[PDB]
Amino acid sequence: GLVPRGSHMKSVFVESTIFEKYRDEYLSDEEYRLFQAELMLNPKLGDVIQGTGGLRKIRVAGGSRIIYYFLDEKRRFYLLTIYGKNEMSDLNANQRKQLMAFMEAWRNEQS
Amino acid sequence: QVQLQESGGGLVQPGGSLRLSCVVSGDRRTIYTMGWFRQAPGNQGELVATMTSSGVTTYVDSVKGRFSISRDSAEDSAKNTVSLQMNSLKPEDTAFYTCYEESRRPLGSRNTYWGQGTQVTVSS
């Protein structure tokens, strides 16, 4: 068929304070738009992390990794943070819990 | 909130012209950048064109000379309409075309808004 396989709805990407501070330290605007395009076609494209409440990790820069939460009803993505491949790739409980907290902090801003 | 409604698309003869269009309204915000993306089936998509709030544009190499991005501020009160003008359409330009716009409301989030998209089929 003509239209490519995936989702084609108006969508919103929402940078967090962290992601906005550190985005351009990592991604050229081409890389960033390619990333949002990929998620817009397919949310659920990132690998789930458990204990987080639905946060996902995508690895496309290279070794850049973004962590995001897609909001089911409002069709907004929360871009939580971006970290490089070499750098802290060690996932522990203090991390998963605080990520879940800030994620829920955005989540309950628009009921 | 911020409203995005887009227009244009369909289906065109080679060498013909089509204007895609895409409007962002709501109340006031600071606009950073804004562009168009395209994706044909089976392969990775490609960013078609970009324009900073300063006018700085990029275009991809395959569309150089033929597509043009332009903009309309509506006094910079209100809305900006972004237009993709496509001329001398080649069949390689057949793709699903989406627009986007980064922008930051007062005391608000740096968001990039994305369109539904629209299929553009350039077939002999």
Test the A interface: residue of B58, B98, B105, B119 with most A CBs within 10 Å: B98
Resolution of this structure in Å: 2.6
Task: Using a CB–CB cutoff of 8 Å, tell me whether A13 touches chain B.
Answer: yes
Q: Cα separation of B50 and A87, whole Å? A: 31
User: Using a CB cutoff of 8 Å and minimum separation of 24, what contacts does B40-44 make?
Assistant: B40/A4, B40/B94, B40/B95, B40/B96, B41/A1, B41/A2, B41/A3, B41/A4, B41/A5, B42/A4, B44/A34
Domain of B18, in residue numbers: 1-124
CB count within 10 Å of CB B66 equals: 15
Torsion angle defined by CA atoms of residues B17, B86, B120 and B122, in that order, rounded to the nearest 10 degrees = 50
Of A3, A12, A33, the CB nearest to B37: A33
Residue contact A10–B41, C-beta within 8 A: no
For residue A48, what are the contacts with CB-CB under 8 A and spacing of at least 6?
A54, A55, A56
Residue contact A36–B50, C-beta within 8 A: no
Q: Kindly tell me the number of DSSP H helices and DSSP E strands found in chain A.
A: 3, 5
Q: Cα separation of A26 and A45, whole Å? A: 20
DSSP B68-81: EEEEE-TBTBS-EE
CA angle A36, B55, A82 (to 5 degrees): 30
Provide φ and ψ at A103, rounded to 5°. Answer: -60, -50
Element (H, E) at B50: strand B46-51
Torsion angle defined by CA atoms of residues A22, B99, A47 and A32, in that order, rounded to the nearest 10 degrees = -30
Q: Which two three-digit tokens encode residue B24?
A: 């962002």
Residues of B in contact with A37 (CB under 8 A): 37, 39, 45, 47, 98
Q: Which two three-digit tokens encode residue A47?
A: 């690998």
* Domain residue spans of chain A: 1-111
The B-side interface with A (CB below 8 A) comprises 4, 33, 35, 37, 39-42, 44-45, 47, 50, 94, 96, 98, 100, 109-117, 119, 121
Give the Å distances, CA to CA, from B42 to B1, B20, B47.
35, 23, 16
How many distinct structural domains can be found in chain B? Answer: 1
Residue A65 and residue A57 in contact, taking contact as beta carbons nearer than 8 Å: yes
User: Using a CB cutoff of 8 Å and minimum separation of 24, what contacts does B11-16 make?
Assistant: B11/B119, B11/B120, B11/B121, B11/B123, B12/B89, B12/B120, B12/B121, B12/B122, B13/B89, B13/B122, B13/B124, B14/B89, B14/B90, B14/B91, B14/B122, B14/B123, B14/B124, B15/B88, B15/B89, B16/B89, B16/B122
Give the Å distances, CA to CA, from B7 to A11, A53, A59, A69, A87.
16, 37, 33, 29, 43
As a whole number of angstroms, the longest Cα–Cα distance in chain B is 50
Report the SS3 class of residue A88: coil
Q: Which two three-digit tokens encode residue A80?
A: 């939580």
For residue A84, what are the contacts with CB-CB under 8 A and spacing of at least 6?
A26, A63, A64, A65
- Identify the experimental approach: X-ray
Report the SS3 class of residue B47: strand
Cα–chain center distance at B43: 20
Question: In CATH, what number is assigned to the domain containing residue B43?
Answer: 2.60.40.10
